[PDB]
């Protein structure tokens, strides 16, 4: 179930090799985004050849030929020659398979094969054949939920610097004359000058930009506006992200946790699988858009019923309310 | 249960109904027929009965165009059908045929409101008129 | 609904007029990459369901 996925994701982070160690200047990057228009930009002609690689050509020609039909609403009629129809029974399989393709784009074949591992002994959700397979590459955890992308990066200082140098290369705009050259006093020591506040953004935008450049715009795209980035570095203790409905924060004990304490079950303890120790804490919070959906659901109950019986409304309430509570539980408090 | 084969009676009555009521009212036309629904009546109009549909052999140009396009956009019949000017089902059948053969008193009492005509340079005194 | 279907009809018509946006060489890159993946993964194709299928 999705929340259990959140748990696999947190303990998946906390079980990574030397994940929280900032000693040498290591930098962690969480990146969340959407493919923006994905369904709408699938090309039928291409989708046919892509399905011919999977199933008997007949099945492929059926599936494809189905996405080409007439959409009617009252007066209006038109043909859909391009975008995929979501409402098809089997549309799911098209979505997930095409998504597999674009995943193969994003991760790259070498790394992807490393994750799925050898087909003779495939891996589970998050784990690798060996530690050296973990340290072998910046991309560490890659989770795709329908059209949403959740990625977790581990960088040594050099790799990060390289990325920063490439983004801050042909990515100037160049524009922003006022911002770019801002004068300050080189006479003084660093600490008596422009401290480090936004410098953390650089690494982030360099990440997001690097990801985007692996997706050809005509296929799909990613908009900085809808995406979100978080970064863990010696300047930033906290690691924030959002999976499914859950807003998650992660604070290690290796950083400044000060007083160690328990709390209501809204606090998860991330336990090292190896050492059976509680190495960090994950706080849960119910995401905004979720609360918004629930509120529109209540508003749906009030508005859509002017006629309906009073016992009926209470059923509507109870259903929605357990719908929220069974799902979120701890995060609600 | 409603579904079934189309009948000359249902089809001619469909002609007349479409003629009288117009293209955009389907529920009214489905009301007259039995054992058929509105969707079925509409799609039965635009698929087959519609006089603008071309029922005849395919010329050489239409076969060239159909084959080329079908090799251009595989399996998309509703995109191709308008380009060649034929019905999707028809050009389908013809394609499989090409591969197959290839191998209260204000009124009646008192004059409602009266404007006596204005009087002008001439004598209206004398004039009066006859009864009926 | 009506607006959305309008801009929809627009986008279909513009996709036919302006041709496929994926260009060509890109599409070949996709098809090829997928091929390599399914190759290294020993994936056998899914056949058509036979008349006699116990499931």
């Amino acid at each position: 179930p999705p929340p259990l996925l959140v748990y696999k994701w947190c303990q998946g982070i906390n079980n990574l090799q030397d994940v929280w160690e900032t000693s040498e200047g290591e930098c962690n990057v969480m990146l969340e985004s959407r493919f923006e228009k994905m369904y709408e930009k699938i090309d039928l002609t291409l989708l046919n050849r892509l399905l011919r690689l999977i199933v008997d050509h007949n099945i492929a020609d059926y599936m494809t030929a189905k996405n080409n039909v007439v959409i009617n609403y009252k007066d209006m009629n038109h043909t859909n020659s391009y975008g995929i129809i979501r409402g098809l029974q089997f549309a799911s399989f098209i979505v997930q398979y095409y998504g597999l393709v674009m995943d193969l784009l994003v991760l790259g074949l070498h790394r992807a094969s490393e994750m799925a591992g050898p087909p003779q002994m495939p891996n589970d959700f998050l784990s690798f054949q060996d530690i050296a397979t973990e340290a072998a590459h910046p991309i560490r955890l890659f989770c795709r939920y329908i059209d949403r992308i959740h990625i977790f990066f581990r960088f040594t200082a050099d790799e990060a610097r390289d990325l920063i140098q490439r983004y801050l290369t042909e990515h100037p705009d160049p524009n922003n004359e006022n911002i770019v050259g801002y004068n300050n006093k080189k006479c003084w020591p660093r600490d008596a000058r422009m401290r480090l506040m936004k410098h953390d953004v650089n690494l982030g935008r360099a990440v997001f930009w690097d990801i985007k450049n692996r997706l050809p715009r005509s296929v799909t795209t990613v908009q900085w506006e809808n995406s979100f980035v978080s970064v863990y570095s010696k300047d930033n203790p906290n690691l924030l992200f959002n999976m499914c409905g859950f807003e998650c924060r992660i604070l290690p004990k290796c950083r400044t946790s000060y007083e160690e304490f328990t709390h209501k079950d809204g606090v998860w303890n991330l336990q090292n699988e190896v050492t059976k120790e509680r190495t960090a804490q994950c706080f849960l919070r119910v995401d905004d858009e979720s609360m918004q959906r629930f509120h529109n659901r209540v508003r749906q109950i009030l508005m859509a019923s002017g006629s309906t019986t009073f016992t009926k409304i209470v059923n509507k309430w109870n259903t929605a309310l357990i719908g929220l509570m069974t799902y979120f539980r701890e995060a609600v408090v | 249960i409603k579904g079934g084969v189309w009948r000359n009676t249902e089809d001619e009555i469909l002609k007349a109904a479409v003629m009288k009521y117009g293209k955009n009212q389907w529920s009214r036309i489905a009301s007259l027929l039995h054992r058929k629904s509105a969707k079925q009546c509409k799609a039965r109009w635009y698929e087959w009965l519609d006089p603008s549909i071309k029922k005849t052999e395919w010329s050489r140009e239409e076969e060239e165009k159909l084959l080329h396009l079908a090799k251009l956009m595989p399996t998309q019949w509703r995109t191709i059908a308008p380009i060649i000017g034929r019905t999707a089902a028809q050009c389908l059948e013809h394609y499989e045929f090409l591969l197959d053969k290839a191998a209260g008193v204000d009124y009646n009492a008192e004059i409602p409101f009266e404007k006596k005509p204005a009087l002008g340079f001439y004598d209206t005194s004398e004039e009066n008129y006859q009864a009926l | 609904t009506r607006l959305y279907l309008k801009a929809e009809q627009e986008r279909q018509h513009n996709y036919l007029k302006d041709g496929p946006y994926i260009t060509a060489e890109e599409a070949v890159a996709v098809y090829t990459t997928t091929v390599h993946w399914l190759e290294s993964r020993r994936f056998s194709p899914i056949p058509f369901p036979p008349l006699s299928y116990k499931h």
Partner: peptide, 27 residues
């Protein structure tokens, strides 16, 4: 004659690009 107005009797009350060829043949 010019201002004859067609009666508004009420009903209520396509081209293709050649790039598709290059693409399809490419695939």
């Amino acid at each position: 004659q010019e201002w004859k107005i067609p009666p508004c009797i009420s009903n209520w009350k396509v081209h293709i690009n050649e790039n598709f060829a290059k693409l399809a043949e490419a695939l």
